[PDB]
């Protein structure tokens, strides 16, 4: 790990003295969900590039900012553009923000992302709550906590079986009910793979057999660091496509479809998240 | 990644100006298949060591060369001796050649290798066409594309479900028919594991349950980079041994058997590949 | 790998000339099993920190020593405190000792550890003999042998299907019989995951489906290097807890329970190991 405890500290204090805002909830916007930033009131923007110690967003479009503000009553801090392992970032960089949030006083982390559907029940457009995850990179050593543990953040061997707040998932199925929507709110297990290339049919079948419902290339690391911090964690995935699971189909997963689906489900997610805010304690 | 775009460029241009040859098809010879180099006509040899930016073949025998020439009508470039992850090479070195070939004008990549049989149907000597692969190293981060993407080579999120040219596999089952052989031409999924040590019984059973038919320690990376380049990809494995899947057997996988099997299936593979050449478009 | 052959040599010779002891059996004490060091007679202690080239035990408690002596007749060398991948150590450091032992003249390696129970048959307190292992980190590249092979230690492609000495496991089931205990001596497959965080329910289910019986974050690397050396290998796990495999349970794996269980099974393991010593040939 390239960061010493002071680095997280100095980044937090810098932000703390450059904004009057004091967030309680940190929200990480996945692919094609960055719109959530518009609904914040008294919004103060910070380009990642100007924040001390932040991973310099190489070239995904150079768009990477930390937006502070109020979202339906709660003091939020949003990450528009997140860091992925496939871009070359070691996991201690990918999750650097999460530890900064903790030192800012945040106690809740909402993670969202796009993901391919492994469960045949799911359909494009669907929203899947994350009940659990399978951290494939983690089994091999790519775990954000690898390296000496710092007591100031958490214990050496944190547990993950209760990573996704049982309360928030219930208060979420409620919100969806109140919202009264056609499709029911899905719920399942998210499996993380490093990417960046898409899975093959044989790989899709492996992920299904392992019991995964959706597949992505992020989230799990942030969740692990969050939990190690004591943060409350809630998250969901937007099924932007159904992974090819048979050799006959002449269809291929592509970033166009993923962003396209993110486009149509845009406001649908903004509402859900915005309303869900009120359901977060304090 | 230690290579900048110019490095691939300079390596290509160097070769381009040191040989009159202009290959269309690149062939990577797996273990005990290097013989394919004899059948090239107007053969021009280059030791890896003399090619700018090529991974310096540490000590597997110091035998590593790029042979250009004509193989049954087609302008070929062959790699005699390939780089493996288990030798310590990062994947961006292992696959460095593939990107060089692309800049040389190659549009087709033929990959061959030796592999242990997971499918009980298979028998030593058998040849298995690769319909698909399971990239275990890739799930954890060991993907040759990890790092910033270069638009000049391909897209950020390339798809792999159609990696193995459906046309060539058919034109290959044909060639085998024409060849009229005892054993039928096998076809299946290749799973890559890093090695270098051989799998245990419990590991063999895992790989079988995942739906793999053959197991090796290479290929997948080159295939991924090839596809990311737009190259056409065809490949097969020579089942040199049947992996131990029960605790009673007092047999052990060994490099002697693997090379021995490669020895007997020698000319059988040279024919197949040589004839298959004519089946490649242009 | 940061070590050259001379480094292993110089470390061995240093020890060889600083102790009159000449061990035959090397014993690696897992979590809460370090007590085995008390039963050695003519015990000579060496702090890791004073041994040339040894990984400097960062901050797990600064307790890391190599204890030489006699254990029930045999010349032993014990490692009290072992190196884990999750602490940040590359595998060639984690397994550095094993190669040192080989050069000291050791021909047998006994590895012990604590592990969560995946097999429902098992219960806390149980002792599971290791018949086989599933090296998940190894499938992705985290294999201690990665890098150029040194003929002086072993072959390039060592086999692992016969890693756990069939003879010693039998002579062990015997010893347990003689010992006449309530619970029968368990036996099974150990799956290694990198950690340091504990598995989720979805991950537990994956590990069960793969056929694993117990789960830990160590051992496999040392075993692989041992075997590559020609060493005889025997090992077992102390089931310190049953991994959570259903979402209803409001229980969580924790280092307190693990050490607690290690505490009660303390002397039970010391006896077993001590007596087992006589069953090791010479
Ligand atoms: O089919 C899929 N496989 C793996 N990840 C994704 C995702 C998630 N994100 C989306 C994004 C690519 O379009 C990249 O960062 C991965 C959507 N669909 C799939
Ligand atoms: O049983 C097996 N397991 C994993 N790989 C192979 C291979 C393939 N190559 C062959 C070569 C070792 O003999 C090494 O580079 C791996 C043949 N048989 C097996
Ligand atoms: O449930 C489990 N999952 C993974 N490893 C262990 C272990 C083994 N060791 C024990 C130790 C943590 O308490 C750490 O180094 C892992 C015991 N229980 C479990």
CA distance to B25, B49, B176, B237, B256, per residue, from B31 (Å) = 19, 20, 21, 10, 11
- Nearest-angstrom CA–CA distance, C51 and C153: 21
Question: Within 10 Å of residue C119's Cβ, how many Cβ atoms?
Answer: 18
Q: Nearest 5°: CA angle at A214, between A210 and A215?
A: 85
Beta-carbon contacts of residue C182 (< 8 Å; ≥ 6 apart): none
Q: How buried is C61 (Cβ within 10 angstroms: 0-12 exposed, 13-18 middle, 19+ buried)? A: exposed
The string of DSSP letters for B29-98 reads: E-TT-GGGGTT-EEEEEEEGGGSTT-----SSSS--EEEEEEETTEEEEEEES---GGGT--HHHHTHHH
Mutate: best of A195, A200, A216, partner B, most B CBs <10 A: A200
Mutate: best of A134, A195, A203, partner B, most B CBs <10 A: A203
The ligand with the least distance to the CA atom of B251 is 2
Nearest CA in chain B to C149: B87
Which partners does chain B have (≥3 C-beta pairs < 8 Å)?
A, C
Q: Which of B273, B234, B237, B235 is nearest to B72 (CA)?
A: B273
A112 CB near ligand 1 (under 6 Å): no
| Coil/strand/helix, residue A205 | helix
Beta-carbon contacts of residue A281 (< 8 Å; ≥ 6 apart): none
What letters, b where the CB count within 10 A reaches 16 and e where it falls short, cover C147-172? bebbeebbebbbbbbbbbbeebbebb
Name the minimum distance, in Å, from the CA of B200 to any CA of chain C: 4
User: Is the peptide bond preceding residue B107 cis, with omega within 30 degrees of 0?
Assistant: no
Beta-carbon contacts of residue B195 (< 8 Å; ≥ 6 apart): B84, B85, B86, B217, C143, C157
Q: Do residues B81 and B57 lie in contact, with contact meaning Cβ atoms separated by under 8 Å? A: yes
- Nearest-angstrom CA–CA distance, A72 and B211: 48
Name the minimum distance, in Å, from the CA of A184 to any CA of chain B: 30
Nearest CA in chain B to C207: B206
Nearest CA in chain C to B86: C146
Backbone angles phi, psi at B95, to 5 degrees: -100, 5
Nearest CA in chain A to C87: A147
Q: Which one of A115, A221, A256, A259 would you pick to mutate in the ligand 1 pocket, going by the greatest count of ligand atoms within 8 A of its CB? A: A115
User: B244-248 long-range contacts, Cβ below 8 Å, gap at least 24?
Assistant: B244/B201, B244/B204, B244/C161, B245/B201, B245/B204, B245/B205, B245/B208, B246/B201, B247/B201, B247/C131, B247/C132
Beta-carbon contacts of residue A129 (< 8 Å; ≥ 6 apart): A169, A172, A173, A185, A186, A187, A188, A235, A236
Say yes or no: B196 contacts chain C, CB-CB below 8 A.
yes
Q: Nearest 5°: CA angle at B98, between B94 and B102?
A: 160
C237 CB near ligand 3 (under 6 Å): no
| Coil/strand/helix, residue B227 | helix
Backbone angles phi, psi at A90, to 5 degrees: -70, 160
Is C138 in contact with B193 (Cβ distance < 8 A)?
yes
Q: Nearest 5°: CA angle at C165, between C164 and C170?
A: 110
Question: Within 10 Å of residue C24's Cβ, how many Cβ atoms?
Answer: 16
Say yes or no: B150 contacts chain A, CB-CB below 8 A.
no
The ligand with the least distance to the CA atom of B217 is 2
- E-strand spans in C118-250? 127-135, 186-192, 214-216, 232-242
Q: Which of B85, B106, B167, B158 is nearest to B131 (CA)?
A: B167
Say yes or no: B209 contacts chain C, CB-CB below 8 A.
yes
Is A201 in contact with B132 (Cβ distance < 8 A)?
yes
Q: Which of C25, C29, C51 is nearest to C38 (CA)?
A: C29
- Nearest-angstrom CA–CA distance, C254 and C273: 26
Mutate: best of B62, B197, B250, partner C, most C CBs <10 A: B197
Q: Which of C121, C71, C58, C125 is nearest to C269 (CA)?
A: C125
Handedness of CA B165, B169, B172, B174 (dihedral sign): negative
Q: Are strands B25-29 and B108-117 parallel, antiparallel or unpaired?
A: parallel
- Nearest-angstrom CA–CA distance, A188 and C247: 12
Experimental approach was X-ray
Which residues in chain B are contacts of C132 at CB distance < 8 A? Answer: 200-202, 247
Which residues in chain A are contacts of C254 at CB distance < 8 A? Answer: 157, 159
- Nearest-angstrom CA–CA distance, A185 and A116: 16
- Closest in A131, A160, A228 to C199, CB measured: A160
Name the minimum distance, in Å, from the CA of C195 to any CA of chain B: 14
Beta-carbon contacts of residue B26 (< 8 Å; ≥ 6 apart): B76, B77, B78, B79, B97, B98, B101, B106, B108, B109, B110, B231
- Nearest-angstrom CA–CA distance, B243 and B208: 10
A240 CB near ligand 1 (under 6 Å): yes
- Nearest-angstrom CA–CA distance, B178 and A39: 67
Q: Are strands B65-71 and B74-80 parallel, antiparallel or unpaired?
A: antiparallel
Is A139 in contact with C141 (Cβ distance < 8 A)?
no
Q: For chain B, give percent helix, strand, coil, nearest 5.
A: 35, 25, 45
- Nearest-angstrom CA–CA distance, C276 and C271: 8
- Nearest-angstrom CA–CA distance, A16 and A10: 10
Which partners does chain C have (≥3 C-beta pairs < 8 Å)?
A, B
- Nearest-angstrom CA–CA distance, B277 and C10: 55
- Nearest-angstrom CA–CA distance, A103 and C131: 47
**SS3 sequence of B136-155:** HHHHHCCCCCCCCCCCCCCC
Question: Within 10 Å of residue C240's Cβ, how many Cβ atoms?
Answer: 29
Q: Nearest 5°: CA angle at B155, between B153 and B156?
A: 115
- Closest in B1, B134, B209 to A202, CB measured: B134
Beta-carbon contacts of residue C206 (< 8 Å; ≥ 6 apart): A134, A210, A211
Q: For C32, left (φ over 0), alpha (ψ -120 to 50), or beta?
A: left
Q: How buried is B53 (Cβ within 10 angstroms: 0-12 exposed, 13-18 middle, 19+ buried)? A: middle
Which residues in chain B are contacts of C133 at CB distance < 8 A? Answer: 200, 202
Is B197 in contact with C146 (Cβ distance < 8 A)?
no
A192 CB near ligand 1 (under 6 Å): no
Which residues in chain B are contacts of A87 at CB distance < 8 A? Answer: 146-148
Name the minimum distance, in Å, from the CA of B35 to any CA of chain A: 31
CA C13 to chain centre: 24
CA A277 to chain centre: 16
Q: For C234, left (φ over 0), alpha (ψ -120 to 50), or beta?
A: beta
Name the minimum distance, in Å, from the CA of A281 to any CA of chain B: 36
Domain boundaries, chain B: 1-282
Backbone angles phi, psi at B118, to 5 degrees: -100, -40
Is A140 in contact with B138 (Cβ distance < 8 A)?
no
**SS3 sequence of C29-63:** ECCCCHHHHCCCEEEEEEEHHHCCCCCCCCCCCCC
- Which overall architecture, per CATH, does domain C1-282 show? 3-Layer(aba) Sandwich (3.40)
Q: For chain C, give percent helix, strand, coil, nearest 5.
A: 35, 25, 45
Is C156 in contact with B196 (Cβ distance < 8 A)?
yes
Say yes or no: A245 contacts chain B, CB-CB below 8 A.
no
Q: Do residues A228 and A103 lie in contact, with contact meaning Cβ atoms separated by under 8 Å? A: no
- E-strand spans in A81-185? 108-117, 127-135
Bridge partners for B71 per DSSP:
B74
- Nearest-angstrom CA–CA distance, B45 and B27: 14
The string of DSSP letters for A252-272 reads: ---HHHHHHHHHHTHHHHHHH
The ligand with the least distance to the CA atom of A155 is 3
Q: Do residues C202 and A132 lie in contact, with contact meaning Cβ atoms separated by under 8 Å? A: yes
Handedness of CA A98, A101, A105, A111 (dihedral sign): negative
Instruction: Give the distance between the most distant pair of CA atoms in chain B.
Output: 58
Q: What is the resolution of this structure in A?
A: 2.3
Q: Do residues A100 and A66 lie in contact, with contact meaning Cβ atoms separated by under 8 Å? A: no
Q: How many CA atoms lie within 13 A of A270 on its CB side?
A: 15
- Nearest-angstrom CA–CA distance, C204 and C249: 14
- Closest in C197, C205, C252 to A143, CB measured: C197
Bridge partners for A173 per DSSP:
none
């Amino acid at each position: 790990n390239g960061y010493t405890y002071e680095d997280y500290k100095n980044t937090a204090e810098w932000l703390l003295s450059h904004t009057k805002h004091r967030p309680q909830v940190a929200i990480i916007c996945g692919s094609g969900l960055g719109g959530l930033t518009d609904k914040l009131t008294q919004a103060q923007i910070f380009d990642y590039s100007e924040i001390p110690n932040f991973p310099r967003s190489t070239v995904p479009g150079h768009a990477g900012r930390l937006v502070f503000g109020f979202l339906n009553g709660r003091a939020c801090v949003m990450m528009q553009g997140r860091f992925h392992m496939y871009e070359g970032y070691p996991l201690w960089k990918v999750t650097f923000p999460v530890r900064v949030f903790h030192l800012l006083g945040v106690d809740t982390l909402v993670v969202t992302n796009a993901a391919g559907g492994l469960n045949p029940k799911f359909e494009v457009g669907d929203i899947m709550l994350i009940r659990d995850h399978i951290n494939l990179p983690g089994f091999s050593g790519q775990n954000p906590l690898r390296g000496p543990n710092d007591e100031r953040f958490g214990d050496r061997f944190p547990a993950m079986s209760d990573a996704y707040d049982r309360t928030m998932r219930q208060r979420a199925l409620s919100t969806w009910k109140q919202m009264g929507e056609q499709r029911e709110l899905q719920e399942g297990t998210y499996v993380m793979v490093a990417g960046p290339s898409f899975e093959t049919v044989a790989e899709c079948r492996v992920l299904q057999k392992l019991g995964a419902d959706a597949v992505g290339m992020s989230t799990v690391p942030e969740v692990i660091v969050a939990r190690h911090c004591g943060l409350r964690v809630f998250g969901f995935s937007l099924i932007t496509n159904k992974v090819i699971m048979d050799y006959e189909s002449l269809e291929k997963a592509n970033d166009e479809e993923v962003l396209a689906a993110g486009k149509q489900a845009a406001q649908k997610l903004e509402q859900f998240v915005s309303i869900l805010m009120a359901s977060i304690p304090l």
